[PDB]
Amino acid sequence: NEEGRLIEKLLGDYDKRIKPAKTLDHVIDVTLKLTLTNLISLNEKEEALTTNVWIEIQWNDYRLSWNTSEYEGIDLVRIPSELLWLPDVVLENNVDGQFEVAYYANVLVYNDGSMYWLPPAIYRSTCPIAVTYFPFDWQNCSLVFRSQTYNAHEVNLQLSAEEGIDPEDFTENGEWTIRHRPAKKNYNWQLTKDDIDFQEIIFFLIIQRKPLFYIINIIAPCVLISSLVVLVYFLPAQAGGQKCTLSISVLLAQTIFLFLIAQKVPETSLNVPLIGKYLIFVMFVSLVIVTNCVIVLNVSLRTPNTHSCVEACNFIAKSTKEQNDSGSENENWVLIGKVIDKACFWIALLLFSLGTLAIFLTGHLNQVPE
Amino acid sequence: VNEEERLINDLLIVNKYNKHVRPVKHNNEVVNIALSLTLSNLISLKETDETLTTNVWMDHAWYDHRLTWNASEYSDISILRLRPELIWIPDIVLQNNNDGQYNVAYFCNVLVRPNGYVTWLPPAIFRSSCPINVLYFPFDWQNCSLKFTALNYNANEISMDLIIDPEAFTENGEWEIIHKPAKKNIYGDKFPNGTNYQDVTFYLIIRRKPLFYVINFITPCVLISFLAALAFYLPAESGEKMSTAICVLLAQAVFLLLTSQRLPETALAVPLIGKYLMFIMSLVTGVVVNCGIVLNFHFRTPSTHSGIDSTNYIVKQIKEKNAYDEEVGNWNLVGQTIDRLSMFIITPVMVLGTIFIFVMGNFNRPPAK
Amino acid sequence: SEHETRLVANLLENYNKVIRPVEHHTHFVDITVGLQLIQLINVDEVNQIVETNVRLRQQWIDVRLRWNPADYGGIKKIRLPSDDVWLPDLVLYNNADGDFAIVHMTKLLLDYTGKIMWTPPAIFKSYCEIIVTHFPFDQQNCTMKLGIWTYDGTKVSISPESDRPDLSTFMESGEWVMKDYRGWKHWVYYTCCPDTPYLDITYHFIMQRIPLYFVVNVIIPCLLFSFLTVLVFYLPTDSGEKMTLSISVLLSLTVFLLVIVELIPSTSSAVPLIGKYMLFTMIFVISSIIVTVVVINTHHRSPSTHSAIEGVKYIAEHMKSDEESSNAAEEWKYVAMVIDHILLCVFMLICIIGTVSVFAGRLIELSQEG
Amino acid sequence: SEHETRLVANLLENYNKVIRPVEHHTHFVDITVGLQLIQLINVDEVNQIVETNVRLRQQWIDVRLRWNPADYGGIKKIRLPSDDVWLPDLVLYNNADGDFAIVHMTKLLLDYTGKIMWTPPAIFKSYCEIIVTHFPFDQQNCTMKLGIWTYDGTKVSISPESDRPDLSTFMESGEWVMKDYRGWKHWVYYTCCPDTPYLDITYHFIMQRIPLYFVVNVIIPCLLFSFLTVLVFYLPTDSGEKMTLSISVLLSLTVFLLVIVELIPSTSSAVPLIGKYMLFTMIFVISSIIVTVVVINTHHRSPSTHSAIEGVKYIAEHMKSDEESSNAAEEWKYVAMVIDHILLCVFMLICIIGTVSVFAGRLIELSQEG
Amino acid sequence: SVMEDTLLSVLFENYNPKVRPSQTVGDKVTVRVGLTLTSLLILNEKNEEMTTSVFLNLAWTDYRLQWDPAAYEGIKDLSIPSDDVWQPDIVLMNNNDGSFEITLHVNVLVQHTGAVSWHPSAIYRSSCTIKVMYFPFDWQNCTMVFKSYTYDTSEVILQHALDAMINQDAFTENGQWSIEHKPSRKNWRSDDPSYEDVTFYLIIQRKPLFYIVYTIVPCILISILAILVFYLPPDAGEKMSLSISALLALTVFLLLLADKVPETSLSVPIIISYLMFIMILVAFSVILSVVVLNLHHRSPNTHEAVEAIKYIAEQLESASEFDDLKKDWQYVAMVADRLFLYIFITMCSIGTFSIFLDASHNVPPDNPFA
């Protein structure tokens, strides 16, 4: 039906770069929305991410409501992307890595100027997550994206679901989790003093993490380690004196392990994000353990050395007996461990307090945001 | 305006100009081309793989015999600009150092002399496979060879004739640039039965040697050494801490072997000469042996490693008797041997420790020659 | 030639590339997919990405491509390059990790009559389920869906041909190993839109892992360390003069076990293996730990130990006796009746625990072996 | 309408793009520019690379762009696409490492006039000074020059604008801080050639780095290894009976920090620094060694300490008298008098090169702070 | 001018850009392929990936470009870009690991009666069957198959250069490696109507002789410590302790050896062969160190009335001395000698074995490089 002739008609008339514009002072109304589908990389030390976004694009151009041969042959249409006005998308706040295959995707015409286009894009971005978003109370990732291109005086974007998410297409390769996701539609004029307002799209993303696996990676070493120094503490009451050298081997080994745990995981928070909180209990719990641990030896270090003619000769020999006894005896008196035994229970409660102060407080920072 | 618009419509670059025809003034020898090479920067040096990423100013000159000008072209301005399409562009090829395609030295803005001669000379980020070998590491650190030219054309379609170096040295080279000659040529080969295309041959003779390996590297050899050194001093001042004298060898020993381990690691980074690697290993060994000798000769030793009268006579008999036992131990002592030992350790410290810095110095007198 | 020039020119003139073979409102464009993965190049557990060999067998028909002695006449069916065609925008839904390799501008074959195939030699980047369940010995089935991008079944329709296994031409340079793979068809209409949307090929990759070199290295030190530990018990009861001797030991061992753990988490981090696989190495490796700890604290456990010329000989002899007493006290201290008990105490335990360990070992060897 | 088509049509017929707008043998193309830096996403430390954004504000004129009531009439200041314009090839001399990201294909501000400007949110990777002397405590000012490339003076011209500071949009998450930033213009003719070459804006960034995290943990293992060596000396006094013990802790201590230095080489070459620096830890750590060198050499310092019936009772006590004098002669050697001087000897020595380390440290920050 | 416009104009009047250099279906046009190699840069021994560089010389004859007086007789040789014709495409069945760099679309040498010469050098990403069979001194085997990638020999034919050209034609001097050969066999895959690929064989030889040398040290040096620690026991038996330090150390060592190795096969791995038995030699000085340990284990103890006093005395000392003399009986060193010479057998036998293996490896599986 006129199929040929109608096509040929308006392709006389057809203008590309021009918006279907009454005039050039009062803009078009454009519809947009995004459905997450892939959160590829969460580099939080370096606070950037890559996501496959469904760029729901919609807008009106009556440059083409149709008659007879188009509107009514097919209320629906597939005409090439590369044939008119298309907005250049980007996350003012996030857009970090040019769009990927997110453009040059066939566009959807109505027959009264309804226009709809979705497509998919993997790109980089730049959310929160510096030295916090570690905690239990999540950081809202706030991404606003619009058109790169023009400013709101001849373009005007519309929005979605500020309320309802997130895990529609959340990565399963999270150790993370999302618990809400805000989205509002707004204008451009900021702290900085920028006028000629260019609309945009705000994307809040408060999310959880911490399904902990390493937890007990961290957990076991340093329980092991507290019982390891529990051996250092109770095995000295039992021990003899050749247990000086004993003990020490232990402290060598004790921190060879210690620091090697301190090298490990420090690295970890460098290569992904950062939060100090948890950081701080480990090293410093770990340091005070050390602390007291060699203090302990300085406690069984202290102490200066505990660390007839018949009868002329009977006279002197019966003195070497009493004599050396007295001396030997010296050592006795000197190392009668009143210190040691109690030094077991000294550290014991102290050990307990350390333990406790920590796990107790971890039982809290898990039991408030529980 | 001089009939300008109109004249650059007269000439028509692309339309009057044969873009598919080489303005060689028809059949003769060639249009006469000259290349100029100026490095703007050297960003990375690889030893292991013979590969260098460097930036060059591709200064190019050749006559466009259709680019002679008249009044509103020549004169109006003896010098103008013109894009890559209004533009025969060759393929100067880094013949043997262009195993890394030329970037941003392809078709950018060129300079239009006022009667054909044209001038195109921008930036080249490139990668090269220079004459490394496992031998660009001896101190000479050789001469890097590179040839530049329009690849395609022959000595009857092409002729290229011919600057330093430290024009734009990368100061964040661990190496040092001694020199930098430049001389063009032309050449006939094996498979071609003609002579042809002429080229820019530029040899780079350099030298390298951080002032920062010396530092941590000699540090651990005097350190180490003194352990071997101290091992033997301490078997005098008390050689009875047997276990602990030992421990030291376990200790000095494990420390020595990974040392040399970090050695081949930077190694692979970069293929190592035979000069340096021998003094190291041949000597470390040196020690090694003498730590194993240390061993045995430090713990070799098996030991040093009337009836009232009848009764107390038994004891003065167990007395003296086990005094020959007891003594059996001091036998083992060997203390007139003391000074010797530490002596015969000093002799060989002085022979080796010197032998090395002796080899130092005998190769540190001839280069100053 | 048989119509030769008149052939060629007629054809350019009356033919619109851009036009999609739209033959009244019906069948749409009927176009079928058929993937034959010639071979695979590489695959990454960590980042469930694969680079593979596909020859895409694409069929469809344009009745506008039937001919006479002026097209067929010339030469039967021929070779026509792409361009003139309408090319579906194929896409691996939950895959599709980028754009098809060397896809664009290749050739195809037309018959005198019409029928066209486009079966080109692809190799591309993929994206698939591994889940924590892929490094199963029992595997996970990689769910991979394929079909027409942004066109439903009204406008056009991607269909199936086709079941085939995965191990049909599986990469012979995997470490690894398949069970089977199957692919069935489906039509996805959505709860969105009352409409009839496109069609899809769903792949199911069912394959289990582990070239067996790895496996060996790691478990034999654990048997090796078995024996050391073995001494660790035997040494001590048989003479606790080198107690600190074995101190050595305990230090240099658990660090070893430590070092193993670095190696297989990074690989964790580097290759996801279903987590509950790790508590195997967990308890097991950890009992080496609780065993030590105890055995060698307890090894320490012990308080102790770990006429008148005649009556001068009896004051002296009486000094040799009491101390007679006392000698026997401290040896009375380190008995060799009960160190025997800890020996068989825990060794039974170890062939308990051992056999237990052998449990999950043997168990998912009852399910792999099949 | 208002000469609608005759206005658009006329502008493209007498419009060309081969030509640049150059005005007589003149004052060059009056190019205006400066700053709009608001984000620095990534910059490396180790390599002195900087990927930032700056909207390069350009401003110039071209008389030919003067209009009447049939282009100014219209709509005053309309905004043209960028294409139509002969854009300056701007670049960071030294630098220019990256392609400028997002410049092509833009929006361009036209007036009825004349007035033209284009604010392009350019993001790119950079390369400038810093050196080995960047991260001192006395600073460095990265020199960054920008301007046209292969065009001198006699053609073409740019000029900097305005004073704004550096800490204007300095990274707040900076392990670091700025002090100041200046940019002044200039034109560059060379001694080479008698010609006027190109014009350029030279920035200089002056800012100190390092956040303190790294710091608190470098020191710690310092202090705590000093304690050990402090123990190294105390021991012999308190517990010389463990001299072999004291050797233990040296092998201990030394291999530990030998080890700490591995890290360094890996993290230093992975974020480069002036050598100058390590020369501190150097001798202060060689100091532990140099000091165990002398103190245990000195520790071992001492060569050896490191009637007739009546007659035999006297042959026996005589056995005892010979020896007794003699042993006095080994204890004679370890007097425990000059052990309390070596600790004091070195207590004061270690109190002073420990206040040493604290010295250059503080000095240098009396010089930083300033 | 001699009818220049005329030839020039006929040619571009009868040439077809889009067309095959043939007249219908024979025969086709017999193209010559033959590559002068430049050098090779990287053998990724591990994965079997080959990046080299060569010249793509193609050459056939165009009867469509026979010239006449002025470009024939004028200038018998003229340079002309490509673009115009059928170019090879070529993929390497195996191989073709990725694109062409300077290979295609480069100018060419066109002779008078239309011989065509095309002279490009290129880098190409290939990966051949070097396998995990590129380390046995016997070396191996590979297929390098080049050929186009939609073209099925049916409209042309491929033919090579030499067959002796060798692969030590351009063998890389830099190579720590070496060159047995490369033949060249043309093939046509009958599983296809298409005439495909050509197979080029790698008889390659890898003898970088640099660090095996100091690898020989660990095998001989290690045994040092071995002979040693089994030569220490009946040397100073009170090796009691120090013994176990020997092996903590000896063990950890041959472990870390197992650290490095897996890491260096990293880029690099093959045939365990070397590994396989030094592994054995490993497990050897494992278990032999441990048995001997058992050897030590061993020792189930060790691991007047005036005359009435006298008597008392007489009994005290003798009594207990033969009891302690018993223990002497119980640990005499008859074993140490016999088993240290069992140590003699064990270790100079196991030593002269992999010395044999090694002896056999260099001399036996060498030759068959042909």
From TrEMBL, chain A:
Keyword Transmembrane included in the entry's annotation? yes
GO biological process assignments: acetylcholine receptor signaling pathway
**What is this enzyme's catalytic activity, as reactions?**
Na(+)(in) = Na(+)(out); K(+)(in) = K(+)(out)
Domain (Neurotransmitter-gated ion-channel ligand-binding) spans: 4-211
Keywords, sorted A to Z: Cell membrane, Disulfide bond, Glycoprotein, Ion channel, Ion transport, Ligand-gated ion channel, Membrane, Postsynaptic cell membrane, Receptor, Signal, Synapse, Transmembrane, Transmembrane helix, Transport
Pfam families from the entry?
Neur_chan_LBD, Neur_chan_memb
Question: Record's SUPFAM superfamilies?
Answer: Neurotransmitter-gated ion-channel transmembrane pore, Nicotinic receptor ligand binding domain-like
Paired cysteines (S-S): C127-C141
**Which locations, inside or outside the cell, does it occupy?**
Postsynaptic cell membrane
Identify one Gene Ontology CC term for this UniProt entry. Answer: acetylcholine-gated channel complex
How does it sit in the bilayer? Multi-pass membrane protein
Where would you find the membrane-spanning parts of this chain?
A: 212-234, 246-266, 278-301, 343-365
Transport is among the record's keywords:
yes
Q: Name one GO molecular function term.
A: transmembrane signaling receptor activity
Q: What does the annotation say about its assembly with partners? A: Pentamer of two alpha chains, and one each of the beta, delta, and gamma chains.
| PANTHER family on file | NEUROTRANSMITTER GATED ION CHANNEL
| Job description of the protein | After binding acetylcholine, the AChR responds by an extensive change in conformation that affects all subunits and leads to opening of an ion-conducting channel across the plasma membrane.
What family does this belong to? Answer: Belongs to the ligand-gated ion channel (TC 1.A.9) family.
Name of protein:
Acetylcholine receptor gamma subunit
From TrEMBL, chain B:
Which cellular compartments is it found in? Postsynaptic cell membrane
Q: Name one GO cellular component term.
A: acetylcholine-gated channel complex
Q: List the disulfide bonds.
A: C130-C144
Which Pfam family would be a valid example here? Answer: Neur_chan_memb
Q: List, alphabetically, the SUPFAM superfamilies matched.
A: Neurotransmitter-gated ion-channel transmembrane pore, Nicotinic receptor ligand binding domain-like
- Every copy of the Neurotransmitter-gated ion-channel ligand-binding domain together lies at 4-210
Q: Principal localization? A: membrane
Q: Where are the transmembrane segments?
A: 211-234, 246-264, 276-297, 341-361
Superkingdom per UniProt: Eukaryota
**Which PROSITE patterns does this chain map to?**
NEUROTR_ION_CHANNEL
Topology with regard to the membrane? Multi-pass membrane protein
A single GO molecular-function term is: transmembrane signaling receptor activity
Q: Name one GO biological process term.
A: acetylcholine receptor signaling pathway
* InterPro entries named in the record: Neur_chan_lig-bd, Neur_chan_lig-bd_sf, Neur_channel, Neuro-gated_channel_TM_sf, Neuro_actylchol_rec, Neurotrans-gated_channel_TM, Neurotransmitter_ion_chnl_CS, Nicotinic_acetylcholine_rcpt
Keyword list (alphabetical) reads: Cell membrane, Disulfide bond, Glycoprotein, Ion channel, Ion transport, Ligand-gated ion channel, Membrane, Postsynaptic cell membrane, Receptor, Signal, Synapse, Transmembrane, Transmembrane helix, Transport
Which reaction(s) are listed as its catalytic activity? Na(+)(in) = Na(+)(out); K(+)(in) = K(+)(out)
> Would you identify the family this protein belongs to, as annotated?
Belongs to the ligand-gated ion channel (TC 1.A.9) family.
Q: What does this protein do?
A: After binding acetylcholine, the AChR responds by an extensive change in conformation that affects all subunits and leads to opening of an ion-conducting channel across the plasma membrane.
Q: Which PANTHER family match?
A: NEUROTRANSMITTER GATED ION CHANNEL (PTHR18945)
Subunit description? Pentamer of two alpha chains, and one each of the beta, delta, and gamma chains.
Q: What is this protein called?
A: Acetylcholine receptor delta subunit
| Natural source organism | Torpedo marmorata
From TrEMBL, chain E:
User: Where do transmembrane segments lie in this chain?
Assistant: 209-233, 240-258, 270-295, 339-357
**Source taxon at top rank:** Eukaryota
Q: What chemistry does it catalyse, as a reaction equation?
A: Na(+)(in) = Na(+)(out); K(+)(in) = K(+)(out)
Q: Which GO terms describe its biological process?
A: acetylcholine receptor signaling pathway
Which InterPro entries does the protein's record reference? Neur_chan_lig-bd, Neur_chan_lig-bd_sf, Neur_channel, Neuro-gated_channel_TM_sf, Neuro_actylchol_rec, Neurotrans-gated_channel_TM, Neurotransmitter_ion_chnl_CS, Nicotinic_acetylcholine_rcpt
- Topological relation to the membrane, as annotated: Multi-pass membrane protein
Summarizing the function annotation, the protein's role is: After binding acetylcholine, the AChR responds by an extensive change in conformation that affects all subunits and leads to opening of an ion-conducting channel across the plasma membrane.
* Protein's UniProt name: Acetylcholine receptor beta subunit
